[PDB]
Amino acid sequence: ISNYINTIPVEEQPEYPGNLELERRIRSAIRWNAIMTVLRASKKDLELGGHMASFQSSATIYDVCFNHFFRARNEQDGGDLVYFQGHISPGVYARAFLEGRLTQEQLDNFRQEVHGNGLSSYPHPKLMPEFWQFPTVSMGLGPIGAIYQAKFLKYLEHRGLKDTSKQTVYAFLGDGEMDEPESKGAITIATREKLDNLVFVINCNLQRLDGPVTGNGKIINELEGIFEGAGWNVIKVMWGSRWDELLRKDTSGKLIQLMNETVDGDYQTFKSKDGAYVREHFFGKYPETAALVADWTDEQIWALNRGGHDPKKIYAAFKKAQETKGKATVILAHTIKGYGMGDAAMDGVRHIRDRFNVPVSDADIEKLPYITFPEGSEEHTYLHAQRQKLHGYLPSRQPNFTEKLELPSLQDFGALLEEQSKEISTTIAFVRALNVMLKNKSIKDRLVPIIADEARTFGMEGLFRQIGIYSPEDEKGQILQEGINALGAGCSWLAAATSYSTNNLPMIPFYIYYSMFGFQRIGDLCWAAGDQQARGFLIGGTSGRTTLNGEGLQHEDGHSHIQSLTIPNCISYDPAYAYEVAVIMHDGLERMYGEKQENVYYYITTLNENYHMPAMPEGAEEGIRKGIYKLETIEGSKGKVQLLGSGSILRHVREAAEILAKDYGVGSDVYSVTSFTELARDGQDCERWNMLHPLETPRVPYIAQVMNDAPAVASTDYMKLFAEQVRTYVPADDYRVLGTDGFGRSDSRENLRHHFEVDASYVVVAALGELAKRGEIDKKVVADAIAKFNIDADKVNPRLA
Amino acid sequence: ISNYINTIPVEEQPEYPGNLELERRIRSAIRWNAIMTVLRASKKDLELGGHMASFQSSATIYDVCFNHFFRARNEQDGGDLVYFQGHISPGVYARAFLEGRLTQEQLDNFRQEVHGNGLSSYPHPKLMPEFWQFPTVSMGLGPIGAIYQAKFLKYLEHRGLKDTSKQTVYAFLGDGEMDEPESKGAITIATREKLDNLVFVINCNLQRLDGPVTGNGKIINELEGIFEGAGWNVIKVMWGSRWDELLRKDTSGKLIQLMNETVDGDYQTFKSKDGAYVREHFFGKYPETAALVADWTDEQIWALNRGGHDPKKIYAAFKKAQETKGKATVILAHTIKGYGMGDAAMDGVRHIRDRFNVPVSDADIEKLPYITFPEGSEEHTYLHAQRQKLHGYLPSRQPNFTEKLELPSLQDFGALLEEQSKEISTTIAFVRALNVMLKNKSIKDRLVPIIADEARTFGMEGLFRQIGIYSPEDEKGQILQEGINALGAGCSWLAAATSYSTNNLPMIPFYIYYSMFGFQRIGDLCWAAGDQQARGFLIGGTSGRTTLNGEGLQHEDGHSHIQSLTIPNCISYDPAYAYEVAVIMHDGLERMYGEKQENVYYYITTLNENYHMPAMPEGAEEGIRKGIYKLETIEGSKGKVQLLGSGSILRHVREAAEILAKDYGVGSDVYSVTSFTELARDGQDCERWNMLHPLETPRVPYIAQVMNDAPAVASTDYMKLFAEQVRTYVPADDYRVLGTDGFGRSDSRENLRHHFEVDASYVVVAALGELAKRGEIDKKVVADAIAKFNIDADKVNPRLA
């Protein structure tokens, strides 16, 4: 922690390259338009919202960047990757409007997007696919996301995939936002990986939303202390140019001392008062400091500004950041929240019009007019020339990659479709599917296997010797090993999964980790990944409540599919067999990276239990992709039921199928359900369509087409709702669902499958129960199956155990 | 960073107080029993799992703490709160066995707990309610949980509720675990809050599971850098006692330079080699370092050890932490993973029994016997005497608090049960319910309102003036303001919600924040909270997809209830009216903190939308608690339907009820569904019981005791599955569900409710469609309805928008 003054002393400050007065004229129009946009929205009284104070305190920081640093997407690379602070969006839209990229009608539809021609509240690529790039409003995700994006750019260069050397990643943060654990939690990574293509810009207005960050301390000092401690290059932009004569004059070092001893709350107090209150409470703390302004008019005291509002001080910090090599740089920019808004942060509008010398007449002010710069005007010429010199405009986004990939065919996954000699797991199947892909010429180097420490647990160890581990085990290593860091791996996955848009270079990430630590731990990143149109694979290993038996409560996943189904563009599967994994993976590949270029990402849960893997039945492909297909039909003269299973539990549903046939004469149709979620969504779409087209013939849900009306029983390694979600679309009067509701615990797979009530004997008892409620068999036979299977009818509900 | 040697020189090291020789003997028995427990489980070949290498590396650190530092729960306070590293639990179980607290049968049932007399793999209070206290195996959570627990103890003391000055919070962490962003993401708070009652003990063995944490770097230096930068007191325990003479005679300073420049990878390489190797590749790097050991045998060089295995250096560190005030302390304990296990890292166990001089006959090593110390023996006496001096044994847990609280009655919330004057929201209702609680003499000071910065956004600003904000706005402040830190607020909430157990001081926390950032963002903590038996309230404000209209994609919550339902002991509600909010909060208060002491926590979604709040229907109380009650029946002779709604959408369903009756002569039964989830669970419990008792009187789901068989339509502000989950138990053959599936976006409430197809118009069309399919009205009526309401039958499905 250094003195509370600029890191870059004036003697080392480069000459500012732009026309200050002209840039200020342009900036004032941007400030004006951003405010008009939000005010016009308010006028509608539709509780739309929108911020103004924030952008006002940081506009000059962004302005210097737009005039002198931000490289736009170009023929060589995707340009600088800017994670704009979400709340300043009205400012971004204002500039875009000025550069003629957005129309007045769009600004007038700020926060009204349903009818089509509006603008999102915040950066949401999903909502504005050709404009926004990085979802940042969920505080904390932007900084860690940016760190891993920068690391990913380095990876692409080291792999020889693309020269990203001219690209800088900028993460614009708030000082209040830094309290989010994800904000500073991963900063040492930028040091380990020498990310000199990453710049953190923290707007230190000493305020958050409902107050200051730390009123009793000095948030800027805390930030410097930990970033410096983390090995980062720290640049403090504390004071404007007016303090420079004062400082090279305070021979006593008393001013420095005064600046160092004053705390955040007070500096904020000074903000509100005036020159008088300042010359007396601040400069009047000592005679050596009271003497520096003792002969300064008050109004001149009040003109002393913070560095974050001074273009010259800002330019030097970014220029310095740009030159630094070997480590990341963090710029702590000192600003005034609600700067120049007086009163608050038509009299109010009048005040800002005057404050920024905005070209709006008294006659026009009540219309809340937007300002434009005609072709030919000095402002219009300069605005565009600065951007042209920096390759164009940003933000902007390309929704589809341009090259055509030559994807492996399903037949290339041929060995996985036939009966397996050895007993293997769906996880071993996954790894083998990866190997097929690694032999494909077109995509083999585009694949990004991602792991979080654990490789051996998922049988990934063999890949290590074939493609290596990225480690700038060398800079050509292909596998990304992120250590014990679920969020970080997820961020690497997101960067790779969105490379197709960002750098027009499709990369196909496969992130495998404990399914329990997927959506449950990084769910907010998964939702943002959907917003960012991520196209990749999330592989939930060691999944299923009863299957990762020995681990217990915090590891046994009986609900990740309940969490994954809440993401509109995430496609989820829970396969039982190796051939299903093959078919599913081929399809996602095709959908996401084939000509269709569908904006979805896949979630497949895999298992750590080995068992016999049979051959795929001929013609089952489409059923597998759709979510359900009939495996077999077993004869039986005394009854008929339908049995559904998925994942590790399918094997047990089939055992029940034989027990029913063998001991009770009950026949059945056995179906493998590769995705209850995809079937429920299909069912919902059909009922929605039927409701909206009452004069048409009702469409039939696919599951209803595959199944019949005989009483049905379903069992899975997940909570009941996973299978219950398709109830409305199941064409049978009786649909019983078995599931693993309840906290997991340690034991043998057999004991857990009995405790959660999902094993063969419970499937049998459930099936017989339905046939008895129908009369096909007497209740006494279900009561004896119960005694026979040593089933404890009165043990507590597993959900409560 | 400092030099790569012990922070505490020998000359400042206190004399060790215990019987080393004796302690060693006891420690060796614990190591043996720990390994025996895991090996015996392996022998069963049930894939049980379990670790050994980790406890072996950190056993001595824990041993010094069990013999000289850890205070157990006592009459005055809960004792020291130790967050044991999860995978070293076999060693804790071994120590408990030796203390006579666990039986041999229990150890023999390690990881086999379903039948009652076994042990959980890791610390899980839920599974072993009288033993474990803090669930730590989901890495990263323990560190941040510990920080907020330490801060909460301070709170309790500052608030004058309990003197916790004698308690220390210890968080035992792995070095690999520090990569989780949650691990260091909040360490700055420890300095802000001066948590000198907190100690982080980082086991620096230099490796994660799959290799070194940073082979090419020095994690201990990285760790020291960021913690030092964050203001913590850092104590490194680098080298054992045999290095003291070596360091003392090296006047050249070369040994220190050598230690400083050597990276983690090389240090790990030395541990796998031998003395000769070390002489040449380490000491042999320099003439002066070579000379320091020239006079040593290879075997004597081989005996050089890491500090974390030397009790004297360990003690030195912990004692020093105890005397440090004004900030938290972190001890970086340098160890060897797989310590004393040899190469391995039946009989190959005979190697560790020679290594630690275990008294087991090489002839009986085959039976893998446990070692115990008979009463009367030196070992037994010393073991218990050290613990008695420190108040007993740990870990242990008390499942219920002892005092009786005088809870407010429902009548006390009487004002909230009447018709409200002004239109308010359920969030304003929540705040008024809180106010009633703050008037109760018994619990007024036990309440812990927790906010994450956002106060004005939830109408909490009025409580400030009243009970103040905690800030040691002073140290008597009751409200916890945690800033923009959802995980941190969650940790504070967790500490308070479990105070009834750890301190026998029940505290009742109410953590309100944006519902979107609840389970989605801190879901792993919520799962852990369930495991820790938290009793409190999570209030999801600004909830509902369409209700927080302007905010858009990353704020519009239409699914937190899907996430919350996956947690077994979390009770979820989505009330529409203020009186429902009061009845629910009263019930929860009584269930969790009244005589019942139910181990459950509550999740209530509240709204930011004002509307008319009618009086509670007489006798509706229980129905509100159960999840559904009939609001009213509207007459009509052309047809009859059932209409269900919750949250902000219920008033639109009632609007539809009016329309159906007046425009189409269709009458209806209208139901307020306060909890679809509780209804589904009750339904699941009923069919489960019925399936297991086929000859007995079937049980009837609560929802079927309220609804009839007329066709039904349900609409909510959450995805369809929220209402669809009760399909199986709904006693009507037609149950249509409208919901907000799909990504949110910015617009007016009206436009969003129309886009997500859940407004009054769609409920009407859905109801008519059901009647038309029954031939009760003409299909053309439904078609004319769609036209009249300006419904676009062909707009894309909102899930895909």
Ligand SMILES: [Mg+2]
């Ligand atoms: Mg800020």
Ligand SMILES: [Mg+2]
């Ligand atoms: Mg380690």
